[PDB]
Design a protein around this ligand. Structure first.
Ligand SMILES: [Mg+2]
Ligand SMILES: [Mg+2]
Ligand SMILES: [Mg+2]
Ligand SMILES: [Mg+2]
Ligand SMILES: [Mg+2]
Ligand SMILES: [Mg+2]
Ligand SMILES: [Mg+2]
Ligand SMILES: [Mg+2]
Ligand SMILES: [Mg+2]
Ligand SMILES: [Mg+2]
Ligand SMILES: [Mg+2]
Ligand SMILES: [Mg+2]
Ligand SMILES: [Mg+2]
Ligand SMILES: [Mg+2]
Ligand SMILES: [Mg+2]
Ligand SMILES: [Mg+2]
Ligand SMILES: [Mg+2]
Ligand SMILES: [Mg+2]
Ligand SMILES: [Mg+2]
Ligand SMILES: [Mg+2]
Ligand SMILES: [Mg+2]
Ligand SMILES: [Mg+2]
Ligand SMILES: [Zn+2]
Lengths: 60, 155, 126, 116, 99, 82
RNA sequence: ACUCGUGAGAGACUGCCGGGGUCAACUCGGAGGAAGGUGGGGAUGACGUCAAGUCAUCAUGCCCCUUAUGUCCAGGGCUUCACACAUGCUACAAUGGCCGGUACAAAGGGCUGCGAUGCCGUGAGGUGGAGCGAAUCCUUUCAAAGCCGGUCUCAGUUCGGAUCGGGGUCUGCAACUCGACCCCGUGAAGUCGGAGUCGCUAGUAAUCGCAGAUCAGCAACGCUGCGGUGAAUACGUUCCCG
């Protein structure tokens, strides 16, 4: 992710329809969860490291 | 099958009459898993055949089954680059299963504009010896008698 | 007071026996009105026929969850259990018949990578 | 029967007999028969002239049918193809105007299939 | 007759049970009537994520998030009991809602 | 199709340009970069040079094509065939 | 006094009996029992092979641009078409389409979001908005297949719905390339399909519904999950693949 573009997206857009997610840790535009604010791979890494309070392996 | 013979399901008997043949017939005619609808089809066709023929439905059912059940079947195998047909006897259970299968398949392809009618007419034709199932069994026995020369393979 | 319960595919039923007549009350309606299927009537009445004690027991049913077949199975199991509880004498014969044994099969897990249950997606070597 | 140059079928339900008229279809036939109160299940054998004539009167008074419909259709086509609109160019090329997936589908518009 | 809905929210059974116990002992010490930690349907959130980036979608992973909710229906809300509940410190893993 | 309640939308700058143009009564080539502005009866006798992605293509507008957007009459992709 | 939701414990260990077995593993049958011989499913990929995929998540050695190959903004494109291949949905009709009456489930979501009742619209939807940070209020009393009554009499059809015209609603500053939905006209190909080829051994095959992620609007017939009704067959390894 280009840092120019990620900072630009963080900057308040001139219109309300120009806002989107941009995963914070890595700035991936696609495949990002709204609740956590992190993308697929970031969620994977945090969960496997166990540093995210509440995520765990699922097996039912 | 490689390890050995698998167990066979304990089929239950029909409460309306008391014949497992009716249960087998409804199971064979089942289409898209509509058990009640298939049972209604079978009961309606049976009642129509009964009112057309003026006889006992179960009696005519066993008559047709005994008339159309086969005794010999043809199997295919290749020896020395040539594909040959080998006939072999068939057990009574599989004979009855094939008889029911043939009945259903040749009831499928009639032109009476109504399936509840076509099934009853096919049953009547099988009972009286004018059925497509009867013709199929004729052809099967003819082929077996024609190609039984290779019986020495015994496979 | 006497009580029993039966289960089949999330179908939980309540059954209480009374020494009255042979009437069946299912949520305030008769057996013919509720689930009018010959299969259901025969499966519900089978244990009573096996015991051969017809028309002196009244049952009242409160139902929740499951489907028609599941509820029918739960009811038959519950009435068999109540029969055994009230008269343990016929327990050997009824168990041999096979009505007191719970049926431990239901919808199984759906596994990722497939369409549902156990069905394998269209897998081609092309 | 016969109406506005359209040969009504020998034996067909009126709900589809009126549909056969190019200017009226399934739901239009349903609404028209609901308005007139005519049963939609009767056969052509019981048709009578006066009801048919009054139906013709209503449909000609309230709607445009057959040749007129055609004429405004081709008038629209010609004006759009002359003004250089996107739909005009699509009609020139004989392709769908909505812009569906021309990749594989649209065989209906493209007509028969020819190999190269 | 006044009743206060004491709601407990937590992610781990051990800590939620410890907090519920602590509440029970303090309520008993203060002398108030409490039903106890009645069970409730636990929240279940399931998230599915692709195993690897750049295609390779045939394999995935599934994640779960369990939150346990307990109700402590306190009756006769004595002011001493209320103040004790106010000044009792709970682990951050357990959230206490007073209503 | 644009909702009737809201009405057609026209760019403010283009509206001002056409208003001044038809107040002065001069007819010239207007450098138009709005492919979104809808046409209004006031465009009866004006010329607009829309942008097709390569260069400005001038198009003459009359009453015949009322009710269509500017980009409809300006092709974007060229297809010479095979 | 039973489910119900959620804490602790018991329960399958060849546990016992008879025969085979080197008196050994192991095996067949029987009793008890919810289950009998890893009860059903999931999480779980040993040393290594394919210089397998990923400098477009991220990080990094070297080379390259630095007044550009960095950077703002308007428009256009990623949706182009005489064709070809792959994965799914709709069918090809009577076990059926349509019309009226009529009963059964699970799980999940809701704050700048769900949206009750009422009124007007054929219906998209317009007004208003109680109850909710949620076993309480909304997702309709969660339905569809199912059951009863009527029409169709085998037709390119009351099956089948694409294409093209004429009118509207909704989110958006922004619907012509380029959205979805509602109303209408429109009636095309298609009558079970060639060699060849794919899935499946019990709640399985098939058929019929529901909810969520990404999201203001959606290309959602995709993916993930939760369900209703629910089969046939396995003689046995000669031939095809590993
Ligand atoms: Mg957006
Ligand atoms: Mg993303
Ligand atoms: Mg593939
Ligand atoms: Mg290895
Ligand atoms: Mg490589
Ligand atoms: Mg390589
Ligand atoms: Mg790097
Ligand atoms: Mg650049
Ligand atoms: Mg593009
Ligand atoms: Mg593309
Ligand atoms: Mg379909
Ligand atoms: Mg209905
Ligand atoms: Mg209305
Ligand atoms: Mg309803
Ligand atoms: Mg059609
Ligand atoms: Mg249809
Ligand atoms: Mg055809
Ligand atoms: Mg034909
Ligand atoms: Mg073939
Ligand atoms: Mg969407
Ligand atoms: Mg389940
Ligand atoms: Mg299911
Ligand atoms: Zn990320």
């Amino acid at each position: 992710a280009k840092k120019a573009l990620v900072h630009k997206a963080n900057k308040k857009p001139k219109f309300a329809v120009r806002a989107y997610t941009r995963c914070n840790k890595c700035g991936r535009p696609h495949s990002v969860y709204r609740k956590f604010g992190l993308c697929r791979i970031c969620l994977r890494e945090m969960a496997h490291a166990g540093e995210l309070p509440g995520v765990q392996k699922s097996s039912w | 099958p490689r390890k050995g013979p698998a167990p066979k399901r304990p089929l239950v008997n029909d409460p309306v009459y008391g014949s497992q043949l009716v249960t087998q017939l409804v199971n064979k005619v089942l289409l898209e898993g509509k058990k009640s609808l298939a049972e209604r089809i079978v009961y309606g066709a049976l009642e129509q055949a009964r009112e057309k023929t003026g006889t006992d439905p179960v009696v005519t059912l066993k008559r047709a089954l005994d008339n159309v059940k086969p005794a010999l079947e043809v199997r295919s195998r290749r020896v020395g680059g040539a594909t040959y047909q080998v006939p072999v006897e068939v057990r009574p259970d599989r004979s009855t299963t094939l008889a029911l299968r043939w009945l259903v398949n040749f009831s499928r392809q009639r032109r009476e504009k109504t399936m509840v009618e076509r099934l009853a007419n096919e049953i009547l034709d099988a009972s009286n010896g004018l059925g497509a199932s009867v013709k199929r069994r004729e052809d099967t026995h003819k082929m077996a008698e024609a190609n039984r020369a290779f019986a020495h393979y015994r496979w | 007071p006497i009580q029993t319960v039966g289960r089949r595919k999330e179908a939980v039923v309540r059954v209480r026996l009374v020494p009255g007549t042979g009437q069946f009350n299912l949520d305030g309606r008769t057996l013919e009105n509720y689930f009018p299927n010959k299969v259901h009537q025969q499966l519900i009445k089978a244990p009573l026929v096996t015991v051969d004690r017809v028309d002196q027991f009244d049952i009242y049913a409160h139902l929740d969850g499951g489907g028609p077949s599941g509820q029918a199975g739960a009811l038959r199991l519950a009435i068999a259990r109540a029969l055994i509880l009230v008269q343990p004498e016929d327990r050997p014969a009824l168990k041999k018949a096979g009505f007191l044994t719970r049926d431990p099969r239901a919808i199984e897990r759906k596994k990722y990578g497939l369409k549902k249950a156990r069905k394998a997606p269209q897998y081609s070597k092309r | 029967a016969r109406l506005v140059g359209v040969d009504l079928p020998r034996d067909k339900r009126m709900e589809i007999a009126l549909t056969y008229i190019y200017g009226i279809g399934r739901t239009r036939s349903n609404e028209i028969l609901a308005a007139t109160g005519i049963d939609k299940n009767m056969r052509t054998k019981d048709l009578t002239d006066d009801q048919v004539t009054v139906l013709r009167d209503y449909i000609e008074g309230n709607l445009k049918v057959e040749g007129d419909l055609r004429r405004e259709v081709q008038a629209d086509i010609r004006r759009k193809i002359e003004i250089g609109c996107y739909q005009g160019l699509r009609h020139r090329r004989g392709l769908p105007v909505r812009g569906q997936r021309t990749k594989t589908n649209a065989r209906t518009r493209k007509g028969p299939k020819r190999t190269i | 007759g006044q009743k206060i809905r004491i709601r407990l929210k937590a992610y781990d059974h051990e800590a939620i049970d410890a907090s519920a116990r602590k509440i029970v002992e303090t309520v008993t010490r203060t002398g108030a009537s409490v039903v106890g930690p009645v069970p409730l349907p636990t929240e279940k959130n399931v998230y599915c994520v692709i195993r690897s980036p750049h295609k390779y979608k045939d394999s995935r992973e599934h994640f779960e998030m369990r939150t346990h909710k307990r109700l402590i229906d306190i009756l006769d809300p004595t002011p001493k009991t209320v103040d004790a509940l106010m000044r009792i410190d709970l682990p951050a893993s357990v959230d206490v809602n007073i209503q | 199709p644009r909702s009737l309640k809201k009405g057609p939308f026209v760019d403010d700058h283009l509206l001002k340009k056409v208003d001044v143009q038809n107040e002065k009564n001069t007819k010239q080539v207007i450098k138009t970069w709005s492919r979104r502005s809808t046409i209004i009866p006031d465009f009866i006798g004006h010329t607009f040079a829309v942008h097709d992605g390569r260069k400005h293509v001038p198009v003459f507008v009359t009453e015949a094509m009322v009710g269509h957007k500017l980009g409809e009459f300006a092709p974007t992709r060229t297809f010479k065939g095979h």
